[model samples]
Target: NNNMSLQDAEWYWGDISREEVNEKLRDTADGTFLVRDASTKMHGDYTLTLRKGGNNKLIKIFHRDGKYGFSDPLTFSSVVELINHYRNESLAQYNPKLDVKLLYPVSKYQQDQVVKEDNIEAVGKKLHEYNTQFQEKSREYDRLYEEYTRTSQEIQMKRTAIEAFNETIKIFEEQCQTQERYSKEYIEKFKREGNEKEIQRIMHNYDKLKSRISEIIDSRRRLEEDLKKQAAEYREIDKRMNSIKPDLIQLRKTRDQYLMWLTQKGVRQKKLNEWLGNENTED
Candidate 1:
């Protein structure tokens, strides 16, 4: 297997553990992904560690007959090709529930990208700009979090209401059955006795049972429709929450990265002044 594509691609992290990939993707947005060469399986095999809906999904990448893909027919010619194709296409065929796209390439962390040049002076302005951006993002996150919390509570309340409705429907169903049985018995008694008053009572009871069941069914039907609408609302709230999280995480990490670099260089500490002009140049 020619792994030239995998070798050259930055997204291709060679032989990293699933746990390592998960940590990298933990705070990333849904659809963020990376390719990792398999450590415990076949020599040329790879795994696509994808982040979807705040969880990491491991998708197996197979190489067969000089083609690369998730499974049969193995259309793409290389790992990079497969990744690029999926970036434009939906990965729904692989997992029906998750209609994922390879939206963000899981990038190397800031600490992993070690800077050789000491542009200590430039960091101040960059950090200032990042500080403003981070501040705005933080505020947005807080606002979205409040909405998420409110929506979650609403969903809980609706679910409880739905359950209550279900309980009532269940009881009504039992009542309907009992009423049906009793009505039939009364009808038979009326037939045996030929009593006009008893027959009138049976007819009245039958009408009541019909209306009762119909009312219960109508309530159930309406609730089903409400449940669908509520579900869509919940999904929308969740989608926004998921979308904002990665940006927040990225902003925080970048700001902290520069902060760490500054601290490591003792940028915050007050340096000792030159005493008697005797060569003190370690600022």
Candidate 2:
């Protein structure tokens, strides 16, 4: 049973001597692992193997996924290649730049700064101050626009309703006149009491029609006044929003310049350390 062929063994079972197992473990114990590839791609699952050559062990690492899977290893290359792969392709692709102009005030350390709770609170305060004025002006503009819309709609509805009312009034007037004429003719012919009552009813209905027309006109006047007020408010908001643009632009430019200066300072410090031959200067 111990000498059975690998095919005859149970599934997922492989035979290995204790010495061989210890040797394999020792081979993987020490040494930095590096992937070998030409394209300089960094991200992906990889497989590493150690093959014994004479009395030496040669370790190889390669990318197991992507366009070039079973290709030659990329062992030695400049640091720039690795940086480009991670920074330019992998990281940069995910994070995109925003339209700085749209941000009311520009910030120098938009990307670099590690924002703490205190920093965020400070930013919130500044934003609130800026937005307070902004919203006030914006509200005026919106108010005017809304008024214009509402007034326009009201005017249209009133005009339509008035036309409909006028048509109804005209019909009622004609009916009332016809009834009065008939009543007069009937009273003259028969001295009927019913004819006088019918005449009074027609006159009353005609007066009511006139009153309805007057009420509609009054409502239209009110709508027009409201529209004018809204228009004035909108103009004020537009003026204020426009006035803030210049200040916003200036703030943005100042912040960007400051951040660029900071980045240069950091690079300068790094160079000074290199020149002094102190890679780990803290010690």
Candidate 3:
């Protein structure tokens, strides 16, 4: 059950040096982060190294009483838990100076490398892989946007219905009052004239009118409850969209950077291959 801990994560680079961490995460977008075993005297402690603005921001992960956290009283059972919590929430809550969320992770297995003499094949593969990732993230962002749009439309539509229903209910209630008033007056006049049949007829119509108004009120109450539920759903979709937007943008930027590097490498490689092939052509 505990096998799914921090050590198992690709983002957890155990016992990596500070310089290595910097080299790995350099040029990555802000909010790209990693966890490493802290290079300190303290045992079982960790360090969170994140790319921010231009350089790296380090948050020492302190362990106390079997809990891991950046700040006191906000600890988690494990560093994985801490990372997962901030993936959805803001790290700014722990330290206002670090006003960014953990949007991306620097994976241990990723080869985000430049085209060297030996890494040309790998660099080529990376271009396609990054494009694949970019396309996948683009679809995800679009899905979230579509869902947000639908939820907003539903909220507005429900609001319109509720308002119109309330207006109609108000009019119906006012009409009920008029019905009651006229029925009472007619009954009183009939009583003075001893017209029992007219009195019974007026009371019968008044009872039906009251019953209809009661039914309308019950319907409006049900509609209002439905609207409340829809409003909550709308808020949730809005929050989700806000959370995904920045990450999507960052992914696109990363993909573009990779593409740019790959293209430059391809052009240079072509010239090098042609020049080298000419010597072989002399044979």
Candidate 4:
């Protein structure tokens, strides 16, 4: 919408009389929009062009017959709305993959206020939402990386512990073998003599060593299990983070390109305005 009060709208351009020019088409009074359309569509009365196939639902200008006093009866949410739709719909009909902003830049078409580049206002809102989505995913992305790193470190530590346990177990086995063999030898040596204290001491020490070995085996099993659980956790977090990455990247590109279009359009407007001003100013 032009946000133009009737007074501001009247001051917008010098057309013979206010009644002569349709208020809805005021933004086109300079005939800039008409020339832009002419490169593509056929004309209407008072010099206008078709937008939405002459459908009144989203009607737009189609000037006719030089001065035939003809234009399709048009309607839209607002006149501004119609201009935006026609920019792409009609303009693209003649040009390849056209830029719609040329028909009316947001800065140039000012009335008071106005989607799709659908309206640049719409494009801005879309980018606004996109940036927020990127930020949300960004936080999750970093968080997942940290979790994966910490979990990986834990797994490495566990692997080292397992290696240490393997060495310890090896020594335990050797000690058991030596003690058993030595115990039998002692009993054999004592076969010729009686020794109750020796018998009791050897049995007790051997049983104690066996008990400690079982405990070590149980602890090693638990540590390995714990590592498996931690690895699973890392995968889960990484999956969640990976899911949104592509979406974020896509949004990032969309946001950048949208801004580029607007920036370029603004530059064009400035350049044209400067030329127009220079031409109008007396030497």
Candidate 5:
């Protein structure tokens, strides 16, 4: 739905007095005549060509794109008026053709010819080269990220395994200690009862406990070695990732700086070219 704010309001041409027009001409030789279509709710596109009073040669002018709608019309009008006024004075001081040197290095017809004969293959090659580099860097980053994650996970798993193996060793040692502490009392009690078989059975059980402790100690040592190897591998991966970080940072900085400079130069060149009537040019 269209809003009332977007509606074309009438601007009085005659309301701008002769005295005001003279003062505007004195300040800036150019002034604009604006028109709006009320029914279409659009500003009518028009050119305000200012020429020398005696001669018909064009001097300075103001042009509008015709899409005029403002929340604050008075402010917009005053700004446009000021721009025209300044442009008129500036044109009087310098040749409009001289402004061309400040805008572009090539003529309009030469620029069109260059665009017609532009090297598409060379441009494509450059784009492809950049894309390849980008892809390579992106792949490297992905590889490093994956490697880092894998190493981290492996380290965690190795640590957990070592902890569990140590816990088993601790349980075996406790079992051996408890057997040693109570075996003597059991043997004395069994001998008093003349139960030689029970004493033998207890001794056999103590031997088994001792064997279990030895086995667990060996397993704990193996786990420790595995953990150490995993930790070393993780550290190596970490070092590689850290080494690539500086390159990554520098590449990112370069890309950002290039983009910023490209955008600023593009905008500045666009405005300068428009003023010089080079609407289409590779600046």
Candidate 6:
């Protein structure tokens, strides 16, 4: 039957798994009259140690490593108290002597949130760094693009100079009858046709174009490479920025929530502790 009724309060128990708890103790061969398991969790895995410690048989509670920390300490002064305490939620002869609070454990990796938060901050920092790099790269790409624009104009002017030379070469080809458009012999013959200056000007321009094409194409190549890199880098920074922003914000919220709970509940600690006595005396 499901029932609820107000009644008296008391506590106690002798665990069936007390033997199991004994099995898991640190097994101090040194036999210090105590058994402690620093890593144990719930009532079973526990927080459950059947082993002896001094004169008292104890069911220690309020453990911090795991689920045991979720509630206040439960200790049995006698097995009768254990039964009454489990059923009534307080010892038969005892009650909290002061303002009380439960300190739940956010254990294991849960406690390492700041470490994770720091990494999130690092990701934000890295995004900012990449943004700086993106700005710098864009600056270089823009500068090179402007230089390429001028290079094109210069190339066009040089080609036009060569075209004028072609007209001179044509007239000289008729005059000298060499009919050798690109030959050194054509130049020698053409020079005799009162155009020696054209020989040097046109030939030098040809060399200039030879030098400029590859250099100009290489500028275009660099811009193209820079464009690809910019795209990838921007994508990385954008994605990382978006992802880490929420993570950082959420972590902050969690931190503030925990702190608020801790602050609110942390008051009267000294009073309750004084009444409850130090760490050893059971409330």
Candidates' lDDT values, in order?
A: 0.73, 0.41, 0.74, 0.53, 0.48, 0.40
Model 3 per-residue lDDT tens digits across residues 213-281? 788888889988998998888888878878888876766666555544555554675644442223322
RMSD of 1: 16.0
* Residue 62, model 4, lDDT: 47
Q: Which ten residues in a row have the lowest lDDT in candidate 2?
A: 98-107
- Of the two candidates 3 and 6, the one with more favorable lDDT, higher being better, is 3
Candidate 5 residue 278 Cα shift, in angstroms, is: 30
Q: Give every collision pair in model 1.
A: none
The deviation in Å at residue 155 for candidate 6 is 27
Query: Compared with the true structure, what per-residue lDDT tens digits does model 4 show for residues 1-283?
Result: 4333322332223222323333334435221332222223343312233223222111234433322211344333333344445544545543444323334331324321222444556655665666666666667777878887888888788889988988999999998998888878798788658877888888888889999999999998998888788878878877877896887677666655555444444546564334222332111
Q: Which model scores highest in TM-score?
A: 4
Model 5 segments beyond 4 Å from truth? 1-127, 189-195, 252-283
Candidate 1, residues 108-197: lDDT per residue as tens digits? 443646533347766655655666777778788888888878877877887887788889878877887887787777788778887788
Which has the better TM-score: candidate 4, or candidate 6?
A: 4
- For model 6, residues 7-90, the per-residue Cα lDDT tens digits are 211111122244533432344321111223334333432232222232223544453333232145533333223332333342
- In order of appearance, the predictions have TM-scores of 0.46, 0.31, 0.51, 0.52, 0.45, 0.27
Per-residue lDDT tens digits for candidate 5, residues 1-283, read 1223212222222233334333333432222322222232233322122324322122222224432222223222332443334444444334543231111111123323432213444433443444445456657977988988988888888788888987887777777777777877878777888868887888788788778777877887887888788788888888888887777665544433333333333346454334322423112
Q: Give the runs in model 2 whose Cα sits over 4 Å from its true position.
A: 1-195, 267-283
Q: Which pairs of residues collide in candidate 5? A: 28-85, 29-88
lDDT of 6 at 207: 65
71: Cα error in model 5, Å: 24
Off by over 4 Å in 4: 1-117, 267-283
What shift in Å separates residue 193 of candidate 3 from its native position after superposition?
3.4
Better by lDDT, candidate 4 or 1: 1
